Design a protein around this ligand. Structure first.
Ligand SMILES: *Sc1ccccc1Cl
Length: 460
């Protein structure tokens, strides 16, 4: 039975509004309703992995697991295995996988982050799961961010706290936050970004939704605008939104948006908004294709509609050679030429690099670079031809060209990372000097750039 080189992943996000679900929720897992929907001819084909994020979930873990497993069994005739479940308050993540994947999945991690301080600590934050699927690391974050049209900055702050403090993936990757630890990272939830139009325009917005004319609403969506100004979710992707706003509905119909201010809303308007979202970030030149992104039309217990997204995701096998793992393969090497970091820091300390990759026996520290002044005020850290030669554990090009090198630039004075990035070894050529480039971030904010040339030797 061959190891897969592609899997499909279902991501669901639903804010349940502290109400039990209806008896049938299969439309969610079938990607049926509004938006980019799944072909009917696929309905019996199980996804490899289902990741369900809920918010305002009133159920016990046991109650929800029974609903989910029985739903998937009805659709697919497959009894899914529970990989992980983690709940913080009423925020929950469930990972289910086909039974054939049980011995492909390992290194399962769960964590949560509580956002806010005093007043604002007590119901918002995130849960997450990570694991290895054969040679591929997968991370999943379900967040319920701060509500309210006038709190987009708080949401962005909640995002940065979650990506700093959520402890998933390989703890040996100590310089790297969750935005660098995974081949594929899926981040979803009730992100709570709103359509930022005047209150007086509520009936106009509803009119536009009834006509399926979303363009003038999406141009005011706070997540799209904040992402375009690099205030949040830098270097993440989102599929085009082609479904109606998923909030705020009157319960038991989808015929009505409930937007007017009420005691129950803290006298806040809730103009129709795309609160409920799925974003991803995959390492460079790895296959990831969104095959659905939409909302259900027939699940009406909540003031939110469920959102679904599905993905094709490239995966690799757990490679063994005569040599690595447990030694190097002298036939493999990674060299760096003409490399320099450009950093935004106003500080003057020496810097060195760390190279981290599961193709190395352990991480590699460089010598200190040479600091120069850039012509527009920047710090340029020159490594020239001084970076070490990296010794991969396996030289086979079928393995090595599928790997990635994480790079941290660290202060010699403090050993604190000033920037993190990632370089794909999926090169156009081996034994050939080729340009490389990554942006550098720290706490998910842009801090600089790393560029230079690479020369990769494989056993071919
Ligand atoms: S499994 C895991 C991942 C990251 C930090 C700590 C742990 Cl136990």
């Amino acid at each position: 039975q061959p190891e897969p080189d592609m899997i499909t992943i279902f991501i669901g996000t639903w804010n349940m509004g502290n109400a039990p679900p209806p008896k049938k929720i299969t439309s969610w897992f079938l990607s049926k309703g509004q938006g980019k929907t799944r072909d009917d001819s696929a309905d019996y084909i199980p996804h490899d992995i289902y990741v369900i994020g809920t918010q305002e979930d009133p159920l016990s873990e046991k109650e929800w697991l029974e609903i989910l497993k029985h739903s998937l069994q009805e659709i697919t005739s497959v009894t899914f295995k529970t990989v992980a479940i983690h709940t913080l308050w009423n925020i929950r993540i469930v990972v289910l996988a086909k039974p054939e994947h049980e011995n492909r999945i390992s290194h399962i991690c769960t964590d949560n982050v509580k956002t806010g301080i005093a007043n604002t600590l007590g119901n918002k934050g995130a849960v997450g799961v990570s694991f290895m699927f054969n040679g591929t690391s997968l991370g999943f974050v379900n967040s319920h961010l701060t509500s309210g049209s006038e709190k987009k900055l708080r949401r962005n702050q909640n995002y940065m706290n979650i990506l700093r403090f959520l402890a998933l993936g390989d703890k040996k990757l100590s310089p790297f936050n969750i935005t660098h630890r995974f081949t594929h990272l899926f981040w979803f939830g009730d992100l709570n970004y709103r359509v930022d139009l005047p209150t007086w325009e509520a009936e106009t917005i509803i009119q536009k939704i009834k006509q399926q004319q979303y363009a003038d609403l999406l141009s005011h969506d706070q997540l799209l605008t904040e992402r375009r100004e690099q205030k949040v979710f830098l270097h993440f992707e989102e599929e085009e939104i082609t479904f109606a706003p998923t909030y705020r509905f009157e319960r038991l119909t989808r015929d009505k948006y409930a937007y007017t201010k009420q005691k129950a809303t803290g006298m806040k308007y809730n103009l129709p908004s795309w609160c409920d979202r799925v974003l991803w970030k995959s390492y460079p030149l790895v296959h990831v294709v969104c095959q659905s992104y939409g909302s259900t039309s027939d699940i009406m217990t909540s003031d939110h509609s469920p959102v679904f997204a599905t993905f094709e995701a490239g995966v690799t096998s757990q490679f063994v050679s005569k040599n690595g793992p447990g030694t190097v393969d002298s036939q493999g090497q990674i060299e760096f030429l003409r490399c320099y970091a450009t950093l935004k820091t106003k500080s003057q300390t020496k810097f060195y690099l760390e190279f981290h990759s599961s193709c190395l026996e352990s991480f590699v520290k460089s010598q200190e670079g040479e600091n120069e002044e850039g012509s527009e005020g920047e710090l340029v850290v020159k490594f020239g031809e001084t970076l070490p030669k990296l010794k991969p554990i396996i030289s086979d090009p079928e393995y090595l060209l599928d790997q990635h090198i994480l790079i941290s630039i660290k202060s010699s004075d403090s050993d604190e990372s000033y920037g993190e990035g990632c370089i794909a070894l999926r090169l156009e050529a081996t034994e050939t000097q080729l340009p490389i480039y990554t942006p550098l971030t720290h706490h998910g904010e842009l801090t600089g750039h790393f560029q230079g040339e690479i020369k990769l030797q494989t056993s071919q």
